C-alpha cells in the first residue's frame, strides 16, 4: 500500500528497466501475460507496490519510459516482457538527443516532458499511498541523462516530500563510450544533487570487472550487467513487497544512510554472486554474505571504499536467518575495520531483514554504502569535465541549444563543493 | 523514419553510388528489378503500395553518359527515371562551367527532386553528398547545390563523401584550381566532410587485397562498404547505437574543424580469409594503421582529436573496450590533450554483406574508423602549392574566367585555404 | 566587552557637504578600521575610495562588469573586497592599486561581501541561493553554505565568532557556523523578502530589514523575537546599530534614514536629506558621525 | 574579415545581470519562484503572470498558468498574458516575448526592466 512509481530513461535506462522488471515480475510470479501464475500467497500481498490490478486478471507495471528515440521502446516492447507494460507509458519521441544534455534538457526534452508529467502525473494519483519515485537511467547520454534530470527536477517541484531514488549508470573510468560523457555527467550530477533524494551510483566498468572475477563469465552482454543492476534495484525494495523480521521501507533507509542533505550518493552491491563453477564449492552462511558484501570488488561502482571512509552503509539481507548472526557479523566488521569507518557515529550500519529470498537463492543481501570514496570518482569526472572545458571543445554543441557557457561552470562548482563535502567528512575528526 | 537522402554529383559520384546501391539492395535483399521477396530499409528506400521499392537517390551530373549507363545497366527497374538527372553539356573540368552557367538549370530542377523527396520522408536524418573534388561538374554544381541546401533546408547534417586529388597521381590538370575552389565552397556548407584519395585506396588494394590492377570498380566498392558501414547503425539494431547527428555530436569539436579520415577493415580477399582469426582487438589496430587510411595523408604527422569506430558484426563491448584500451595505451598514436576520451564506439548486430563479384571476403567482423586529426591539414598544404604554382602564371585561368569568374575568387579560396591551414595549425598546437 | 561607548546624538543633521562623486547611485559603504576612510560601491561598475573629513577621492578602482552591490575592508586594510552583478568576487590591493583576485564560482549577483573578523576568509552571499566562504591564501572556495530557497539578500559576520547571519529573500534570517558548514538557527517572522541585516557590535542583538519597511530585532543569546519596529510602507534597505548603543539607524526607500531605539522601537531622529531613497547607512568606528548613502547619486554624512 | 570565434564557436554574450532596482523589486513581491536565472525563470512566463496577477489580482489567475516547459504551454501562456496587456493598454512587446520564449539573451532583461517600467509608477533605472 507503499507504491512506487519507475521511470526508465534513456537506451540504457530503457533496458536496465526492461530487465528489472522481468526480475521483478518473476520473483511475484507474473507471466508476460500479466496473469499470476507464482503458487504463493505472499508474491500476491503486496502486488501494488509496483502493479496495477487490469480489469481481468492482469498486472501492469507502474513504469513509465520516456526517449527521445522509438528504437530502444520498440525493442523493450518486442522483449519477452514487454506486453506487461501499459502502451501508454511509452512516452518516446522522434528525434533522438546526439549525446546531448542541452537537447534532452532544454530543446527536445521540453516538449515531451509535459506528456512524461502527464503520464507520471495519471499514475501517481492512482496510487494510494506513494512512497516515491525511482528512475533509472545513464548519467553521459543526451536523452537519458538530460530528460531524466529535467523529470526529476519536475516531479521534486511537484512532490518534494515524497521519496526520490536514482540509478544512475555513471560513465566509466577507464573506457568511455561516448567523447561527452563528461559534459553530460557534469550537467546531470548537478540537477541530481539538488534534486534527487537518494541516489545509486553504477559503473559499467565495475559491473565488468564483477562480472568477469565472481561471476567469471566470458562474454558478458549488456544484459548481464542489467541483470546484476536488476538484482540490486529489487533487493533495495524488497522489505517493501515481503515480510520482514526486521523491515525497512526506502525512507527509513535513506534517512540511516543520509547524514548531510548533499551526501545522498551511493555505491552499492549484491551477494551472493557465485560463479557457476564454484556455486557447490560456496558455502550459503552470513559470514559468507557478509564477507563478499564488505569486498571491495563486489561493489558496483568503480571508486574503491578502501580509498575513503565509510560515512553509513544499510545491508539488506532475504531469507531466513538470524538477527544474532547478522548483528554480530556488521559489528565484527566495523570493530575489524574501524579505520575505514567514520568515528563520530557510533553505528554505522542499518541492518534489515526480509524473509523472503530471491528465487534460487536459499539467502541473498543488497549492500548499500555511503562513504567518501565516491570523491574520487567525481574527481576523475571532473578531471576531464576540466581538460575539455579549458579549450571548449564539442562546446558548440551545447551552445547552439541555448545554454549558457556560465551553465558549464555552475555544474562544475557544484561538483567541486561536493567533492569537498566528501573529503570534509572523510577527515573529520571527532572533538 | 530514418530516411536519408543521397545524393551523387559527377561521374565519381554516380559509380560511388552504383556500387552504394547495390550494396544496399543485396543488404536488404532488394532484387534489381525493384522489389524484394521490417521497415530497415526506410533509411535508403521508400515502398509503394505494389510493394516495390525505389531509392531515395538523386543521381546528378551535366554529361548524359555516366547517367544512361545507369539507365541502360541492370539497375534500370529500380531508380526513379526523373531521379536520375542529366545534362546536355559536361562541365570539362572547368569549375566556373559548372557553378555559374551550365549548372543552374540543372540545380533548379535537383532542388525540385530533392524538395519531393524530402516530402515523402517523415523524419531526415540528412543528405549524404558523395561527389568528386576535381572535377567541374563534382565541384562547382555540387558547391552549388549544398549552398542551395544550406540556403533553404538550413540544419539538416549534411555528409560529403568528398574525394581530393591524391599527393602525387591525378588524371587532370586544372584538379588543384577546381578542388581549391570546391573547398574553398565546402568548407562554410558540409557539415561533416569525409576525405577521400584515390593513390591510397590503390594502395589498399593493392597490400590487402593483392589487386596488382586496382580500378574504380574496386574503389567504389571499398567506399560502399564503408557508407554502409557508417548508416548501417541506421537501419539494423545493435547494442551502442550510433546516428548521423551523433556523429556531429561527438566528432566536430569546432564547426570549421569537420573534415575526416576513414579507414576500413579487415580488408581481406577470401584466399587469405580464414587464415587469421580477426578478432576484434586485431580489427581495430589494422583500423588504426596509417596505411588503412584512405588519405594519403599519415595520422603520425598529426594528433588524434576524435575517433569514432563503427563495429558490424559479432562484436562485444567487452571486446571492443579492450581494444580501445590498448589504443589509448599504445604510444605511436596520439591524441590531443583537451580530449581525454576522444572515443566514440558504436556496435551493430549486422556482419557486412558480401558483393558478389567482389574481391572483399565474407568476414563476421568489421570496423569503420571516422577520425578527426589535424594530421589532415596536410592534404590542404599539397593542393596550397600545387594551387599556387599554376596560379602564378595563372595558367588554365582564362578558362575559369571565360563562364563568368574573377581573379578575386581564385584569390580568396586560395586565402580561405591558407586560413583553413592556420586553424588546423592552431588546434594542433597547445 | 565592558567598554561603554555612549553615542547619544542622532538627531543632529548633516555636517559634511553632500559627496556627489559617483555619476549612478551608491550601493553600499564600507569604513576603514584605522583611518577615516570610506569606500563607496555604486552601480557605476566602480568603487570609489574617498577621504571623509576632506571629501577628497583618494582612489577610484573600476573593471567590475556590472554593478558593484558590496564592497568590505580586510582588518588592517590591506585589500578591499567587492561584489557585484557581474557574480565575481574581486579582491583589489590598495599598494599596487589592482584587483588582487577574482573568484566566479557564483554565477549570479553577489548581493553582499564580507570578511571574517581575522579576515583570511570571505563570505560572499549572492542571488545563487548560497554563501560561499573563499579562502584568501587558498584561492579557492572551501564551502558553501546552502539552504536558502530565495535570493541571500545580505550577509553579516557576528562581530569576532564563525557565526554569520544572512538575510534571504525567503523571509528567513539562517545564522550559519563558518567552521561546520551548517545552520545553527533560522529566524521566522518576517512577511516578506529580507534586505539587510546587521549585528550588534557585542553580537546580543541581531536586526534584519524587511521589503514592507519591517525591521525585526532579534536576541542572538536569547533566539527570540526582541523588537517589531514598524516603518513605512516602503522597504527597509539596510541598517546598523550604533557602536555600544540602544539606537538602530534604519535605511528607507522613503528617502529618510530612521533611527529607531532598540529599547522600545521608538523614533528618535528621522534625517531627510536624501530626496528618493537611501540604500544604506552606517557609523563611524568612534561614533562621531553616520553616513547614508541613498538612490541620489550620493553619499551625505550626518552628525 | 578578422572573425572572433573559436574555429566557429561563438561564445554566448554576457548579459547585464538586470538591475538592483528591479531585482529587489521582484523580491519584495512576494513570488512562488525565485529569479535564480533570468533566461530560464522568465522563459516559461510564469513568474511574469505572478507578477501581473499581483498588480491586477482580478483578472489575471494563476490556475489559467501552467509551469511547463513545452513550446505550447510557453506560447498559451504568453498569448494570455498579452492579450491582457492588450486589453489593458500595457505594450509587453512581442519582439521581447518571442525572444524571452526562445531564450534568447537579454530578451528576459529587457521585458522585465519594461514590467518595473509599466508596474513601478513608471519609474526609470537610472543608467549612463
Ligand atoms: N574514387 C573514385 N574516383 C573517381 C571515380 N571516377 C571518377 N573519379 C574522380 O572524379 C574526378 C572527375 O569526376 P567528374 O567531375 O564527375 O567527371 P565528369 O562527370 O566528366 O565531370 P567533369 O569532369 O567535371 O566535366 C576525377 O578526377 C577522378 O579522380 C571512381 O570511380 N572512383
Ligand atoms: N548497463 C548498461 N549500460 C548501457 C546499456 N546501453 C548503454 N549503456 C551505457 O550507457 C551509456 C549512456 O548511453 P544512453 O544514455 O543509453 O544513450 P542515450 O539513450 O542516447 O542517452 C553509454 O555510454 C553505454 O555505455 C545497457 O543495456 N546496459
Given at each position: 500500500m507503499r507504491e512506487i512509481v519507475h521511470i526508465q530513461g534513456g537506451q540504457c535506462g530503457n533496458q536496465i528497466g526492461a530487465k528489472f522488471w522481468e526480475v521483478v515480475s518473476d520473483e511475484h510470479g507474473i507471466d508476460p501475460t500479466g496473469t499470476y501464475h507464482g503458487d504463493s500467497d505472499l508474491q500476491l500481498e503486496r502486488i501494488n507496490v509496483y502493479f496495477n490490478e487490469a480489469t481481468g486478471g492482469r498486472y501492469v507495471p507502474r513504469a513509465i519510459l520516456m526517449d527521445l528515440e522509438p528504437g530502444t521502446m520498440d525493442s523493450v516492447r518486442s522483449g519477452p516482457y514487454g506486453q506487461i507494460f501499459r502502451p501508454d507509458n511509452f512516452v518516446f519521441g522522434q528525434t533522438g538527443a546526439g549525446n546531448n544534455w542541452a537537447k534532452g534538457h532544454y530543446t527536445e526534452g521540453a516538449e515531451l516532458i509535459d506528456s512524461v508529467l502527464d503520464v507520471v502525473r495519471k499514475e501517481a494519483e492512482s496510487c494510494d499511498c506513494l512512497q516515491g519515485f525511482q528512475v533509472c537511467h545513464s548519467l553521459g547520454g543526451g536523452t537519458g541523462s538530460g530528460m531524466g534530470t529535467l523529470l526529476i527536477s519536475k516531479i521534486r517541484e511537484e512532490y518534494p516530500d515524497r521519496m526520490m531514488l536514482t540509478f544512475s549508470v555513471v560513465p566509466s573510468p577507464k573506457v568511455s563510450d561516448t567523447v561527452v560523457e563528461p559534459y553530460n555527467a557534469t550537467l546531470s550530477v548537478h540537477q541530481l544533487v539538488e534534486n534527487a533524494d537518494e541516489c545509486m551510483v553504477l559503473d559499467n566498468e565495475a559491473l565488468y570487472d564483477i562480472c568477469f572475477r565472481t561471476l567469471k563469465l566470458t562474454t558478458p552482454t549488456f544484459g548481464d550487467l542489467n541483470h546484476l543492476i536488476s538484482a540490486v534495484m529489487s533487493g533495495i525494495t524488497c522489505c517493501l513487497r515481503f515480510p520482514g523480521q526486521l523491515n525497512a521501507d526506502l525512507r527509513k533507509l535513506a534517512v540511516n544512510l543520509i547524514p548531510f542533505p548533499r551526501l545522498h550518493f551511493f555505491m552499492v552491491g549484491f551477494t551472493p554472486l557465485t560463479s557457476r563453477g564454484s556455486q557447490q564449492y560456496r558455502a550459503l552462511t552470513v559470514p559468507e554474505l557478509t564477507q563478499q558484501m564488505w569486498d571491495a570488488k563486489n561493489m558496483m561502482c568503480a571508486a574503491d571504499p578502501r580509498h575513503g571512509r565509510y560515512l553509513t552503509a544499510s545491508a539488506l539481507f532475504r531469507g531466513r536467518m538470524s538477527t544474532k548472526e547478522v548483528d554480530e557479523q556488521m559489528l565484527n566488521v566495523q570493530n575489524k575495520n574501524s579505520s575505514y569507518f567514520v568515528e563520530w557515529i557510533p553505528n554505522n550500519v542499518k541492518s534489515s531483514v526480509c524473509d523472503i529470498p530471491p528465487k534460487g537463492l536459499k539467502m541473498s543481501a543488497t549492500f548499500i554504502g555511503n562513504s567518501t570514496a565516491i570523491q574520487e570518482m567525481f574527481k576523475r569526472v571532473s578531471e576531464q569535465f576540466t581538460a575539455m572545458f579549458r579549450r571548449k571543445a564539442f562546446l558548440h554543441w551545447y551552445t547552439g541549444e541555448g545554454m549558457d557557457e556560465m551553465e558549464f561552470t555552475e555544474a562544475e562548482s557544484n561538483m567541486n563543493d561536493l567533492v569537498s563535502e566528501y573529503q570534509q567528512y572523510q577527515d573529520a575528526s571527532a572533538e | 523514419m530514418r530516411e536519408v537522402i543521397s545524393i551523387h554529383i559527377g561521374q565519381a559520384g554516380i559509380q560511388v553510388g552504383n556500387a552504394c546501391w547495390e550494396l544496399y539492395c543485396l543488404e536488404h535483399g532488394i532484387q534489381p528489378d525493384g522489389q524484394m521477396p521490417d521497415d530497415a530499409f526506410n533509411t535508403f528506400f521508400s515502398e509503394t503500395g505494389a510493394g516495390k521499392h525505389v531509392p531515395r537517390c538523386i543521381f546528378l551530373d551535366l554529361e548524359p553518359t555516366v547517367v544512361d549507363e545507369v539507365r541502360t545497366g541492370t539497375y534500370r527497374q529500380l531508380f526513379h527515371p526523373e531521379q536520375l538527372i542529366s545534362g546536355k553539356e559536361d562541365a570539362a573540368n572547368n569549375f566556373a562551367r559548372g557553378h555559374y552557367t551550365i549548372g543552374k538549370e540543372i540545380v533548379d530542377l535537383a532542388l525540385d527532386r530533392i524538395r519531393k523527396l524530402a516530402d515523402n520522408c517523415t523524419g531526415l536524418q540528412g543528405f549524404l553528398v558523395f561527389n568528386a573534388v576535381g572535377g567541374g561538374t563534382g565541384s562547382g554544381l555540387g558547391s552549388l547545390l549544398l549552398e542551395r541546401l544550406s540556403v533553404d533546408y538550413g540544419k539538416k547534417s549534411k555528409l560529403g563523401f568528398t574525394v581530393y586529388p591524391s599527393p602525387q597521381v591525378s588524371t587532370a590538370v586544372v584538379e588543384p584550381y577546381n578542388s581549391v575552389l570546391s573547398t574553398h565552397s565546402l568548407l562554410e556548407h558540409t557539415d561533416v566532410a569525409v576525405m577521400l584519395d584515390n593513390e591510397a585506396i590503390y594502395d589498399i588494394c593493392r597490400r590487402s587485397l593483392d589487386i596488382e590492377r586496382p580500378t574504380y570498380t574496386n574503389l567504389n566498392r571499398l567506399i560502399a562498404q564503408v557508407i554502409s558501414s557508417l548508416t548501417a547503425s541506421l537501419r539494423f539494431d545493435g547494442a551502442l547505437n550510433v546516428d548521423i547527428t551523433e556523429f556531429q555530436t561527438n566528432?566536430?569539436?569546432?564547426?570549421?574543424?569537420?573534415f575526416m579520415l576513414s579507414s576500413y577493415a579487415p580488408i581481406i580477399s577470401a584466399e587469405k580469409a580464414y587464415h587469421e582469426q580477426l578478432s576484434v582487438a586485431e580489427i581495430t589496430n589494422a583500423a588504426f594503421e596509417p596505411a588503412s587510411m584512405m588519405v594519403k595523408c599519415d595520422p603520425r604527422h598529426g594528433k588524434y582529436m576524435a575517433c569514432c569506430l563503427m563495429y558490424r558484426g559479432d562484436v562485444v563491448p567487452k571486446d571492443v573496450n579492450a581494444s580501445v584500451a590498448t589504443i589509448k595505451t599504445k604510444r605511436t598514436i596520439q591524441f590531443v590533450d583537451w580530449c581525454p576520451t576522444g572515443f566514440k564506439c558504436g556496435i551493430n548486430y549486422q556482419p557486412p554483406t558480401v558483393v558478389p563479384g567482389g574481391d572483399l571476403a565474407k568476414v563476421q567482423r568489421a570496423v569503420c574508423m571516422i577520425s578527426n586529426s589535424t594530421a589532415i591539414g596536410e592534404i590542404f598544404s599539397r593542393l596550397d602549392h600545387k594551387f599556387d604554382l599554376m596560379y602564378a602564371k595563372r595558367a588554365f585561368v582564362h578558362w575559369y574566367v571565360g563562364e563568368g569568374m574573377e581573379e578575386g575568387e581564385f584569390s580568396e579560396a586560395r586565402e580561405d585555404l591558407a586560413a583553413l591551414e592556420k586553424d588546423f595549425e592552431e588546434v594542433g598546437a597547445e | 566587552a565592558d567598554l561603554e561607548f555612549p553615542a547619544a546624538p542622532v538627531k543632529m543633521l548633516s555636517l559634511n557637504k553632500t559627496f556627489k562623486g559617483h555619476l549612478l547611485s551608491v550601493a553600499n559603504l564600507a569604513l576603514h578600521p584605522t583611518k577615516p576612510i570610506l569606500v563607496t560601491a555604486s552601480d557605476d561598475k566602480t568603487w570609489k575610495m574617498w577621504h571623509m573629513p576632506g571629501g577628497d577621492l583618494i582612489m577610484c578602482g573600476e573593471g567590475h562588469k556590472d554593478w558593484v552591490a558590496g564592497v568590505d575592508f580586510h582588518p588592517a586594510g590591506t585589500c578591499l573586497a567587492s561584489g557585484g552583478g557581474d557574480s565575481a568576487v574581486k579582491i583589489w590591493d590598495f599598494e599596487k592599486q589592482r584587483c588582487v583576485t577574482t573568484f566566479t564560482d557564483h554565477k549570479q549577483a553577489i548581493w553582499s561581501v564580507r570578511f571574517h573578523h581575522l579576515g583570511e576568509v570571505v563570505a560572499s552571499g549572492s542571488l545563487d541561493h548560497t554563501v560561499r566562504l573563499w579562502d584568501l591564501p587558498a584561492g579557492k572556495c572551501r564551502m558553501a553554505l546552502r539552504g536558502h530557497?530565495?535570493?541571500?539578500?545580505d550577509l553579516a559576520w557576528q562581530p569576532f565568532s564563525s557565526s554569520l547571519a544572512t538575510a534571504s529573500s525567503d523571509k528567513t534570517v539562517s545564522v550559519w557556523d563558518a567552521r561546520a558548514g551548517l545552520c545553527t538557527q533560522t529566524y521566522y517572522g518576517h512577511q516578506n523578502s529580507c534586505n539587510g541585516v546587521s549585528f550588534n557590535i557585542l553580537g546580543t542583538q541581531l536586526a534584519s530589514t524587511d521589503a514592507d519597511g519591517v525591521v525585526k530585532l532579534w536576541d542572538t543569546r536569547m533566539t527570540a523575537e526582541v523588537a517589531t519596529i514598524n516603518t513605512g510602507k516602503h522597504p527597509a534597505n539596510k541598517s546598523c546599530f550604533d557602536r555600544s548603543g540602544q539606537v538602530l539607524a534604519v535605511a528607507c526607500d522613503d528617502g529618510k534614514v530612521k533611527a529607531y531605539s532598540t529599547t522600545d522601537g521608538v523614533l528618535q531622529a528621522e534625517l531627510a536629506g536624501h530626496e528618493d531613497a537611501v540604500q544604506a547607512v552606517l557609523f563611524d568606528p568612534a561614533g562621531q558621525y553616520l553616513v547614508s548613502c541613498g538612490s541620489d547619486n550620493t553619499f551625505r554624512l550626518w552628525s | 574579415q578578422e572573425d572572433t570565434t573559436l574555429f566557429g564557436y561563438e561564445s554566448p554574450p554576457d548579459t547585464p545581470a538586470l538591475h538592483r532596482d528591479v531585482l529587489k523589486w521582484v523580491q519584495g513581491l512576494d513570488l512562488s519562484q525565485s529569479l535564480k536565472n533570468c533566461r530560464r525563470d522568465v522563459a516559461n512566463g510564469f513568474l511574469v503572470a505572478e507578477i501581473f496577477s499581483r498588480y491586477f489580482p482580478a483578472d489575471i489567475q494563476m490556475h489559467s498558468f501552467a509551469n511547463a516547459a513545452s513550446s505550447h504551454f510557453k506560447r498559451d501562456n504568453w498569448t494570455q498574458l498579452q492579450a491582457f496587456c492588450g486589453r489593458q493598454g500595457i505594450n509587453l512587446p512581442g519582439d521581447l516575448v518571442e525572444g524571452c520564449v526562445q531564450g534568447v539573451h537579454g530578451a528576459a532583461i529587457a521585458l522585465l526592466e519594461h514590467l518595473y517600467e509599466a508596474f513601478t509608477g513608471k519609474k526609470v533605472p537610472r543608467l549612463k
Open positions: - | 566528432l566536430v569539436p569546432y564547426p570549421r574543424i569537420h | 530557497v530565495d535570493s541571500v539578500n | -
